[PDB]
Symmetry: none
Subunit: 198 residues, 2 copies
């Protein structure tokens, strides 16, 4: 009955909470009305003054910004001209540079890769010999290693069968009485669990 | 007793593990010897080929690096000049911007900031005038609420104590038989558990 007795004190408090919620909501809204009323009076001033003054605000800034934009455009043109004239020369110089230097770079690139070709041909061939020597050795060595590992695997499995059979047998044989002792204690423990659970 | 047999079986598996590793390690050493011997014939050629490859490689790469160094010198040198000229031109281009537009922007800033003075100053005072009433509302309604909260505080304390008195007495009156029966449950549980856990 702990739930009922305690819940009774909870239901009564909740009821008393409503008894306090009533007046509190009335007083809260009562004062909130005064707040909204004052805030409305202030807001009327806020909006009116902000709006009436927003005109000269935006007008002043817009008129100035208008000139600013005009001056900006009046500058953008000659400034872009300087940039254009400059770009024409700068790009021309770069063009007149990328042409000879491009040819030179391409020519040097030719020798760069071509001289590399003269080395790549033998280099790759030598690598083939080295790789073949390694692969051939690793193949014979591999065959031996495979046999070695296979033999070790056989001995590993043979000695493992001597564990998978006798050792596991002993483990399984021990599991029987072990499970018995466990079941006996578990079954008896279940009694306590249920007994203490009511 | 079980742990004794368990460890006993582990002992047998250990001997048939260590002795298994006997020939295994001996053969593995020979196996490793094979790899080592192979590498003794592989790496010898590998290193010799590497030496006879890295030498002409670095040599030819030196030519390439020289080609590139010359290339970069023949590029960076004139490009540094062209870039300096172009940058100096751009600097002058910017100079004819940062100064004219700078003084212009400064005047724009004056027009903005000064306007802000005659726009934010009165606005701040307006805000104060509106905030004054706002604060007044918070003082009047605030003080009222403070009183309402005070009244409700007493009503809260009275209701809390109205519960605290019977609730604490009832809780203590409930905890007595509850803890008493719980103790009986604990005592029996302790005994029952010590009978199984042994
Ligand atoms: C049928 C069965 C029914 C039973 C139901 C019970 C219902 C509840 C009713 C009654 C419970 C009675 C328990 C009263 C406990 C009193 C603990 C207390 O008097 O303690 C004192 C400590 C003081 O300081 P100290 O002694 O440690 O320091 C020593 C430091 N030297 C000295 C320097 C200062 O107070 C501290 O430490 C304060 C630490 C504050 C930690 C707050 C943790 C907040 C986070 C999570 C809350 C989790 C809620 C669970 C959510 C559900 C998850 C599933
Ligand atoms: C003396 C004691 C000291 C402690 C102080 C007082 C704390 C309040 C105390 C006790 C709470 C009363 C007990 C709760 C009553 C249960 C009401 C209920 O049954 O409720 C359910 C709803 C719906 O939820 P549902 O769809 O999952 O369940 C639907 C369920 N099914 C799954 C069937 C569909 O749950 C809802 O309404 C819950 C929504 C979340 C409610 C948040 C309330 C936050 C309160 C104040 C912050 C407000 C500040 C205001 C300023 C605003 C500025 C913008
Ligand atoms: C505890 C510590 C907290 C720390 C917080 C720091 C304070 C930061 C201050 C303010 C944060 C602003 C956010 C609060 C506003 C949430 C109002 C609310 O509850 O939003 C949700 C409700 C629920 O409907 P819904 O969104 O799901 O549906 C609409 C569905 N449709 C659009 C999608 C299709 O939306 C509705 O009821 C619809 C809209 C109702 C409009 C309410 C706003 C009225 C305006 C002014 C009242 C206050 C003026 C006071 C100014 C000075 C304050 C100092
Ligand atoms: C201890 C230290 C030792 C020092 C040793 C020295 C290193 C040996 C020196 C030089 C050897 C260079 C060998 C590789 C150079 C050739 C790169 C090349 O031209 O390859 C051709 C591929 C062909 O692609 P596709 O046109 O048919 O396909 C496009 C078709 N669609 C779009 C359908 C996907 O092009 C591509 O993959 C490129 C396009 C996609 C990019 C993929 C990722 C590229 C990044 C890195 C690769 C760098 C390898 C360099 C290291 C060499 C190790 C020997
Ligand atoms: C001999 C001694 C043996 C030991 C026995 C006792 C161990 C009890 C331990 C853990 C389990 C929690 C027990 C809660 C009982 C069920 C409440 C319930 O029926 O629950 C419904 C919700 C709904 O979800 P669903 O239908 O999708 O899942 C259901 C999933 N279907 C059906 C596949 C299964 O299931 C959920 O919540 C499921 C999530 C897990 C339950 C979490 C809630 C646990 C209760 C209280 C924690 C208090 C938190 C306090 C508030 C903190 C605020 C900060
Ligand atoms: C193509 C046209 C040519 C362009 C010309 C540039 C050519 C490249 C040359 C120089 C650039 C410098 C690179 C910056 C890297 C390190 C910055 C640094 O060391 O940082 C930490 C310092 C610590 O403070 P401290 O008191 O110890 O150092 C003050 C004492 N001192 C200045 C003697 C060191 O912080 C400082 O120096 C504070 C940094 C504030 C810097 C304000 C510069 C304002 C001028 C112009 C604005 C330009 C806008 C245009 C952008 C578009 C370009 C396309
Ligand atoms: C001197 C006088 C005093 C004034 C002081 C300032 C006080 C602030 C109070 C009131 C003024 C704000 C009220 C008006 C705001 C509404 C602006 C508006 O017209 O709203 C609507 C837009 C619409 O959506 P749309 O234009 O994208 O779509 C267009 C359509 N389309 C998708 C289709 C293509 O929605 C938007 O503008 C979305 C805006 C919400 C996003 C806010 C994100 C802010 C970012 C960072 C804040 C950092 C927080 C981290 C903490 C550090 C703090 C330092
Ligand atoms: C129903 C009317 C009862 C009124 C109060 C009585 C009991 C309090 C009950 C509920 C309040 C729960 C909210 C959290 C309470 C924290 C308790 C705590 O553990 O507090 C100490 C910790 C220590 O941290 P600290 O030393 O760094 O901070 C303090 C330093 N500080 C001033 C310099 C910055 O502070 C913190 O956790 C930070 C917050 C501490 C807030 C202190 C404000 C105290 C205000 C007034 C004193 C009592 C007026 C009583 C009215 C008469 C009613 C009849
Ligand atoms: C169902 C869903 C709803 C459930 C909600 C849960 C309701 C519980 C809510 C709030 C109460 C939290 C309690 C914290 C206040 C302590 C009251 C108290 O036991 O204080 C006596 C102590 C004595 O000193 P000491 O060193 O031994 O203790 C410090 C202990 N140590 C050292 C271990 C840290 O003094 C202090 O802690 C220093 C006094 C600090 C004064 C703080 C006053 C703050 C004022 C207003 C904040 C508003 C709270 C509103 C919530 C209540 C509405 C009715
Ligand atoms: C995602 C990232 C992309 C890369 C971005 C790079 C941006 C860099 C930003 C600004 C320019 C920086 C300009 C830096 C100029 C200074 C270069 C120089 O000598 O620096 C000195 C450092 C010295 O390091 P130390 O560790 O020795 O000393 C530090 C010391 N321990 C301490 O605690 O203080 O050496 C080093 O940094 C390491 C070796 C450098 C060798 C140079 C190698 C340069 C080689 C060639 C030139 C560059 C190629 C240009 C290609 C165009 C032409 C073809
Ligand atoms: C889900 C859990 C619900 C219960 C929860 C309880 C607490 C929950 C709260 C927090 C979690 C706990 C978090 C604990 C964190 C660490 C606690 C701690 O300090 O542990 C260390 C100690 C010390 O061990 P050491 O003993 O080996 O010796 C000293 C130690 N090195 C030192 O430097 O001090 O260990 C000991 O106390 C050993 C003594 C054991 C006593 C024998 C006890 C004998 C117990 C049982 C025997 C019966 C079984 C019979 C089986 C049948 C026969 C085979």
């Amino acid at each position: 009955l702990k739930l009922l007795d305690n819940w009774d004190s909870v239901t009564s408090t909740f009821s008393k909470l409503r008894e306090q919620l009533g007046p509190v909501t009335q007083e809260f809204w009562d004062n909130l009305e005064k707040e909204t009323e004052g805030l409305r009076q202030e807001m009327s001033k806020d909006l009116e003054e902000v709006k009436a003054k927003v005109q000269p605000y935006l007008d002043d800034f817009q008129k100035k910004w208008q000139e600013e934009m005009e001056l900006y455009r009046q500058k953008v043109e000659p400034l872009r001209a300087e940039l254009q004239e400059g770009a024409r020369q700068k790009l021309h110089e770069l063009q007149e540079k990328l042409s000879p230097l491009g040819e030179e770079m391409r020519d040097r690139a030719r020798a760069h890769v071509d001289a590399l070709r003269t080395h790549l041909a033998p280099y790759s061939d030598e690598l083939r010999q080295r790789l073949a020597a390694r692969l051939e050795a690793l193949k014979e060595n591999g065959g031996a290693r495979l046999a070695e590992y296979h033999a070790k695997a056989t001995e590993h499995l043979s000695t493992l069968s001597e564990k998978a059979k006798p050792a596991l047998e002993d483990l399984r044989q021990g599991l029987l009485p072990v499970l018995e002792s466990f079941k006996v204690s578990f079954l008896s423990a279940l009694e306590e669990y249920t007994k203490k659970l009511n």
